[PDB]
Structure formats: C-alpha cells, structure tokens
Design a binder for these strands. Structure first.
Lengths: 63, 90, 100, 79, 54, 89, 89, 79, 100, 90
DNA sequence: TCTGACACGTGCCTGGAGACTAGGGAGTAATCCCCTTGGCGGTTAAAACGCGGGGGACAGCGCGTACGTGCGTTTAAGCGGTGCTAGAGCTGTCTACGACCAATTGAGCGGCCTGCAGCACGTGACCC
DNA sequence: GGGTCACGTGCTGCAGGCCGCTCAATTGGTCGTAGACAGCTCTAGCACCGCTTAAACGCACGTACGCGCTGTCCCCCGCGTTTTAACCGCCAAGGGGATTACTCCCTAGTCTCCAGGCACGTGTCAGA
C-alpha cells in the first residue's frame, strides 16, 4: 500500500524534469538565429556558442 | 569550546542572509580570545596598581577605555554599563 | 545572559575571569560587563565583514573579507595591527610614482 | 641542506611585486634569502624550545603560535 | 542476442545524459554569476542563470 | 609595463607565491640545527608560510619607499638595510 | 665645525636641554584638556621630560640617517616623515 | 596655552645636536614641535586616566611610569 | 642564601613568586634557581659599570656609567633595548660622513 | 623593601674599590624588578601552556633560555643549576 | 676644617626558618588508534638559459638661495625667600556581597532515526 | 536497430524530530573579609615676591649645499626555447600521541621561635 507514496516522489522527479524542459524551451527561444526542433543537447550547445559569441563581441569592442 | 554559536546568532541578527566559512569562524574565535586576554590582563593590572583583590565593572570599564580607540571605547563602555545595570536589575 | 539581554554567555566568562589568577575575587557585574563588550565588538566586525562579502556578490564570509573589513577601518586596524590573518591577502596599493 | 635555493628568483620577484616593487636590482635575491633565513631561525628556535619543554617530539601549530606571539606577531585561523 | 539492444539503449541514454551534463558545466562557465559559486551548480539552476543573464 | 600588471595580479590573489615543498625541507634544514629527528605537523608549516610572506612583503614595501625617498625606481640592498636598521634589525 | 663641537658637548653631558618652566606649563597645558584642576608631582613631570628628550634624540638620529641615504646633510621634514613611517608612526 | 612655542629654536638645536644632526632646515622646528606635542599628549592621557581611576586629584610618578611602561617604554630610576 | 652559596635573598624571591599571581604553587627549588640568575645578571652589569667608572677616573658609579656599560655590551643592549635610564645620557656616536 | 644591600655587596666582591651613587642604585633596583617580572611572566605562561599549577626550576630555566641571548643564557643557566645543586647538597 | 659617606653600635619587629599533617596533583604504567612518514609513477608548469634593446643610474657642470656664523640688544628663567591649604595618608568601625556548599530544573547539544528532496540509472514510448 | 524524450526506481544527502546526557542557570543558606565610610593629622604642592645672569631675539654678511640640466654606458627587462622539478594521485608501515587507571610525594596550611634585617644615631675617614 505504501508503494502509492512513491507516486508522489515520482511526481517530484517529474517536476524536476519538467522544470528542465521548460528552461530548455526558454533557453532556445532566447537565442538569436532561432530554430525549431533543436534537441536538449543542441539547445545547450547553441546557448554555449551564443554566450561565447556575446562575450567575444563585447570583449572585441574593447582593448 | 567555541563561540561559533554566539557568533552565528549575532551574524544572523546583523546579516540574516549571510553565512560564514569555517576559516572565518576560527578567525573570529581567535579574535574573541585575544580581546578577553587583553581586558582581563589589564583589569588585573589595574587591581594590582590600586591594591585591590577584586575585579568589578570599574576595572573592566577602565581596561576597555585604555585598550580601545576613541569610538570603540565609548560604545563598548555603554554596552557594558547597560548590561550590568539591566542584569543587576534582573 | 537571558536577563542581561546578551547572546553571549556570562557563566563561562565568570569562570574565565576567576580562572587564570587574575584576581582573588570577581564581582557580579564584571562577567556581564565584559560579555556585553565582547558581543559588541564581535557584532561590529561581522557587520563590516558581511559588507565585504556583499560587495563581491558573496553570501558567505571568508578570511579575505575579514582582512578587507579590518584594514579599511582605522580603529580596528590599529587594534589588530599586529595580527596576521590566514588567507587574508593584501590591499591592492600601488604608489603613484610607479605609474606612467 | 641547500633548500633555501628551492625558492627561485621568479619566486622572489613575485613576492617583491606583492610588496609593490616595480624594479628589482640583481643583488636583491641574495639579500632576501639571508633575511628570510634569520626570520625562520628565530621562529623555529622558539617553537622547538616550546616543544622540548613539553617533552614532545612533534612540533605543533601552537608551538609556532607561541613562538610568533612572544615576537609580537599573532596569527588568526591557526589556533 | 537481442538482449544487447537494451544494454545498448541504456548506454545511449547515459551518453545523452553525459553530453548534456558536459554542456551544462560549459554553459555555467559562461555566465558571470556562476563565478560567485564555489560548489557545482545543479542542472536546473544553471539553465535558469543562463536565461536570467541573457 | 608588466611589473605593474604583476603587482596588481599578486596583490589581488591570496595564494602563496613561494614553493611549498622546498619550504617544508627548509624548515627541517633549519630546525635540525636546534634538534635532530624532529617531527612536524603540516599546520605548523602552513602557519610559518603565511607569516614568512607577510614579513617579507612588509619589508619590500619599506624598501620601495626608501628607494622612492632617494628618488630612485629600483630597489637595492642599501634600501633594505636602511629599512631594517630603522626597524631595529 | 661648530655643529660637530656642539654635538660632542651635548653627547658628552647628561643635563636636560629643555628649560623646565616652559615644559611644566606645556604638561599642564595638555593635562587640563583631559581634566581641569589637576595637581602634579614634580618628579612625575621630570620623568616625562626625560622620556620626551630621549624620544626626540632617537627621531633625530634616524632623520639624519635618512638624509644621508638621500646623499644630503641637511635634515628636512621629508626625512622625518620617512623615519616615522618606517617605525610605524 | 601656547607653551609648545616655549621650546625655542636653540632648544631644538641642542636636541638635534645631541642626536648627531649637523645641519637643520628651517622647517624642522615646526615639524618637531608638532610631533613632540602629540607624543606628550598621548603619554599624559594615560597618566591622567590612572589618576582618575584612583579618584585622585594629584598625578604621581607611578601614573607616568605605568603610562610609559604600557606604551612599551620602560623607565629606570623613577620606580 | 647561605646554603645555596648566594648573596641574593631566597625567601624574598620565594615570597614574590608565591604572591604575584604567577601560579597556584611554587616549588621549593625555584626561588634558589632564580635568585642565582638574578645575582649573576646583576654582577655582569656591576662588573662593567665599575670598569666604566674606572675609565672616567671615578671611584663611584653614576647613571652615565651604567648607560655606557649597557650600550657597549651587546647582550645587555638588546636586553635593555627599549629601556630609558634616568641621567644615563647618550653615547658619543658621530657619523663619519659629517666629519671634515 | 629594596635590593641596595645586595647590589652593593656584589659590587664590593667584584670591584672592592668602588661604590654606587643614589641615582645609579635606583636604576639597579628598577632593573631587578624588571628582570624578575620578565622571567616570572614567561615561567607562568609555560605553566599555563602545559596546564600546570606549579612553577619549578624547569619553567624558569626554559624562560631563561627563551629570554637571554646564547652566551649569556648559558652562563645564567649554569649558575642557576649550580645554586640548586649546592643548595640541595647543603 | 667642613660636609657627606661609610663603618660601627643599638633597638625592635617581621619574616624566615624549622616542624608537622593531609589532600590533590603530578608522575608512572598500560593499551589503542590515527597521523605522519616514506615510497612509486605520471603529467604539467615552472625554472633556467640565451639574445637584443631601451631606460635608468651615475657622473659632471653651473647658479642661486637659505642657512650658518658673528655681534649687539633685550628678556625670561632660575635661584632664593615667604606663606597657606587640600589632598593624601593613617587609623578605626561596620555592612553587604561574594565565596563556598548543596540541591533542582530546563534547555541545548550530540547522536540516531525518519522523511523529503536530489542525483543517477534503467525501462518504455516515440520517431527515423 | 539507433537516438531522443518521458516515466519510475534505487541510493545518498540534508533537514527535522526524538532520545539521552550534561551544563548552566536558578534557588537557598551560611560565614568572613574587603570595601566603604568616618575621623584626624601632616606634608607637599601651589601661590606670591624680588634679583641677577645667561639665553634668546634681532640684524647683517658670505659660503656651501642643493637644485637643475646634460651626456654616456651598463644592467635589467621582455620574449622565446629547452629541461627539470613540482605537484598530484595512490599505497603501506610504524611510532607517537592520546586515553584511562593507579600510586606516591610535595606544598600549603597551621604552629612555634629567633636572629637578622631595617631604621636610626654617632664617630671617623675621604673628598671637597
């Protein structure tokens, strides 16, 4: 019967996964050159490249 | 023994959202020990100079005034004075 | 402590005053007076150290913050002038004559 | 023997830089090593004396703290 | 024989996690706010800081 | 140009600029002159390292001021000696 | 030539080089700042004067050395300031 | 008031000569007087504090000796 | 003092150690050991001071002689490096660069 | 109380043909008190560090070694050791 | 010949010395655990070495002012003498607080367990 | 069959709660000393007055030192390349320190007694 309690814990694990999924959509949509159908790894990869580019550009403007 | 409990409580009262490292805490404990020795030593010397066998708030107050710089001396004395008056009353 | 309104202990302070052969006798006010003083000085340092932490976006105090907080305060710097602080670091002071 | 040479010229330069020194003559390195050697001898000799008095064979941080403390130098964080 | 397909699947799933985790650490390094952290940030926090930073 | 950058860099950071291993050996090298077959706690050595750098840095600062007083840029042993003599060494 | 003979004479002798009444008035001039209507023992005041002159002599020696380091004979406040700073004053 | 001026230029000359000074700039007299006044003020404040603690009206030699001693300067001959 | 072969008083040293808040207890041999040390150090100064008096054709020791004896002797000079001596005077030190 | 009797006797035993001025004697008395405090202070600290309630010749001998320079310490320690040896032997 | 110091003589009290007893502290012995010391292998960064150029330091020359030195005039400090009070020192008396000892109670800390949250892994579903 | 996403399970860590133990705080009682208060006396310090000598202050003149300017040479600084040590990670053994228990001795406290030490006065000697 106590196995039912695990469902709440399963929901908690799902909540963490869902928070990640929501942030992936926001993270991808907040980038320039937006594209659909990017997978989670691709969204992160393009986010990494964007931030490197953004850092490079602001650094390029100085010194 | 340590003051980590009391230091943390004071830190929370001043900075409710700020934590403290173990290294910083060790430093604060050394600080407190240092201050104690300075005052206790001077209070004893004052009693010696004045041929007294006991320590009272007067010896502590004078030791505080001698040891601390202008602003700290004034404020530390005020805190000591109230605590004794308040404790004595209660 | 409770009646004195202090966070810091008094009974151990009383013990430490009678211990170490400082005097033959200790008055009731002495442990209390001192406990208030120790708490006061502690609070002042913690306040400044916390500020040093905030200035660097930290929520946690480290020895570097304690060093900065003390040396920036002339009363504390004099009081602790002979004190070395582990991992405290140094102030970034450069003489003007050395600059181009 | 000869462990003082283990502190190399670049190490001396880094220390001098921390002290705000912009330009260093070639004679500084030998002078600096001599100064440090004296400092270490003074602190260590006192720390060892404290250890011996206690009839111990292992030197502790407190022996160093006492050695420094009596020399007008206290150290917070190490005890 | 076909048992290997499930073993391969669990290894593929871990490879996907490892690739994402590697990207999460790299992403965190590019956000200045992460510099204030001593401990490694959790997956959700890093993504949140990246969008907050942008 | 580099020297100013180095001063800023080293003043900003908190780590030791000396090497730890030769320091540990040096402590024994000296300590053995007082007593042989000694044992040491690592915390004792670390305490010494912090004190040693702080000591030398303070001397360097005074040495630099002495050179400046003489309107010079470089530091020399003569500047160290003046600071040391005034400080009672 | 005159200065050297004066140095030798003052180093040879042991008497106070400051007139007492001006000194006594100075002590009372200061002491009144802390508390009014004070009384002083003469021996206490003389103890102060001896310490004060000893202090200045030490200051002058270091000041002179600083001027010498700078390859000068005449002492300036600049030399005093360096000596005082090095000694932590 | 103004008894610091009571230390005349000749007084400074005599003291400077005792300290081995051969030649003196015109600015020394004022700098020296400023320093001396501050030095003496610190010593007296401690001596007076001792007198006040004892609730006395008269400052004694021991108040001075204790003041000097706590400042680091031990004096022989006055107790 | 007679038993120890000392000129200095043993009882007085014991009393000072016993009543000076140095510790709860004092060992019987401690006063003797210390009295000998104090006597030795005293003798070192007196021997030098007597020589200083002789060098000035004096048959009596004055504060200047003590000053001369102390500051010429390195060990004593370090020991009394911060001591001020009443009527001690100064040593006749002049820098060569100042001379013609 | 004073040490003038003992200081004078020692001088006579070293230099029979000279005496001590009043000012010089006041200085010697100040000296003796200063040395006593220095040694007794360190001996007390040694007892404190090692959590001991008794001061013996060991704490004093160590205090002498810590306070005095090499050559002087060797001679001072030898005299202290001999005095105890002679005392306990007599 | 006089003044100050040293030596000698006299008187009184305190401290030191000697004697005795008990408890607590110090010293000694045995056992156990952790840290330090010592050794081996691999990788990366630091140190060491070499070369070329510029700036800094040192040396030399010239000029002017401030400082140093001497003389004369004016003033204060020092020395000696006179007068009075408050504070300091000493003695005696009385009380409250602290110390010392015993007895209780409450809160907090430390350790252990439980619950909740987080991280990593495996399986099923969906898409190609 | 491969890759991604979604769902559930297993294990670990942190926070909260509970249990057990200790200390401090609290409460109560007794005894003595030290501190506080009161009274009395004397000295040193403070205040005032007068005179003389030496020092300080003011004025004038000249020199040396310090400052400013110019020129030359060497060392240090900066960069690149090569070699070694430092640093990092992993593994093993022994000794010292730490912890616990037991025994013995010394000092402090208490008690008793005397001389020397300390202070004061006189006489002689050495220096003035």
């Amino acid at each position: 019967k106590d196995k039912a309690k695990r469902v709440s814990r399963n929901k908690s694990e799902k909540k963490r996964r869902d928070q990640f999924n929501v942030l992936i959509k926001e993270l991808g949509s907040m980038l320039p050159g937006n594209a659909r159908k990017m997978d989670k790894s691709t969204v992160l990869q393009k986010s990494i490249d964007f931030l490197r580019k953004h850092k490079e550009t602001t650094a390029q403007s100085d010194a | 023994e340590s003051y980590s409990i009391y230091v943390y409580k004071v830190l929370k009262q001043v900075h409710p959202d700020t934590g403290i490292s173990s290294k910083a805490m060790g430093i604060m404990n050394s600080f407190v020990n240092d201050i104690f020795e300075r005052i206790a030593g001077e209070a004893s010397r004052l009693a010696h100079y004045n041929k007294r066998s006991t320590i009272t708030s007067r010896e502590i107050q004078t030791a505080v005034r001698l040891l601390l710089p202008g602003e700290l001396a004034k404020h530390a004395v005020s805190e000591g004075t109230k605590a004794v008056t308040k404790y004595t009353s209660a | 402590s409770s009646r004195a309104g202090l966070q810091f202990p008094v009974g151990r302070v009383h013990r430490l005053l009678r211990k170490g052969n400082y005097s033959e006798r200790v008055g009731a006010g002495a442990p209390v007076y001192l406990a208030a003083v120790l708490e006061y000085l502690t609070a002042e340092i913690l306040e400044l150290a916390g500020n040093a932490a905030r200035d660097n976006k930290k929520t946690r105090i480290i020895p570097r913050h304690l060093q900065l907080a003390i040396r920036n305060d002339e009363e504390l710097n004099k009081l602790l002038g002979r004190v070395t602080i582990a991992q405290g670091g140094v102030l970034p002071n450069i003489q003007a004559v050395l600059l181009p | 023997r000869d462990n003082i040479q283990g502190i190399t010229k670049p190490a001396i330069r880094r220390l001098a830089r921390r002290g705000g020194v912009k330009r260093i003559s070639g004679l500084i390195y030998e002078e600096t090593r001599g100064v440090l050697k004296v400092f270490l001898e003074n602190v260590i000799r006192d720390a060892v004396t404290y250890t011996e008095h206690a009839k111990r064979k292992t030197v502790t941080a407190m022996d160093v703290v006492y050695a420094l403390k009596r020399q007008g130098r206290t150290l917070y964080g190490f005890g | 024989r076909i048992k290997n397909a499930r073993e391969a699947h669990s290894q593929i799933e871990k490879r996907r996690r490892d690739k994402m985790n590697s990207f999460i650490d790299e992403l965190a390094s590019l956000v200045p706010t992460c510099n204030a952290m001593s401990r490694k940030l959790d997956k959700l926090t890093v993504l949140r800081m990246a969008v907050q930073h942008m | 140009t580099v020297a100013l950058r180095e001063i800023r860099r080293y003043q900003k950071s908190t780590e030791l600029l000396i090497r730890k291993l030769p320091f540990q050996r040096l402590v024994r090298e000296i300590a053995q002159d007082f007593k042989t077959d000694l044992r040491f706690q690592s915390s004792a050595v670390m305490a010494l390292q912090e004190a040693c750098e702080a000591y030398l840095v303070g001397l360097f600062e005074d040495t630099n001021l002495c050179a400046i007083h003489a309107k010079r840029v470089t530091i020399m042993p003569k500047d160290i000696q003046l600071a040391r003599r005034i400080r009672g060494e």
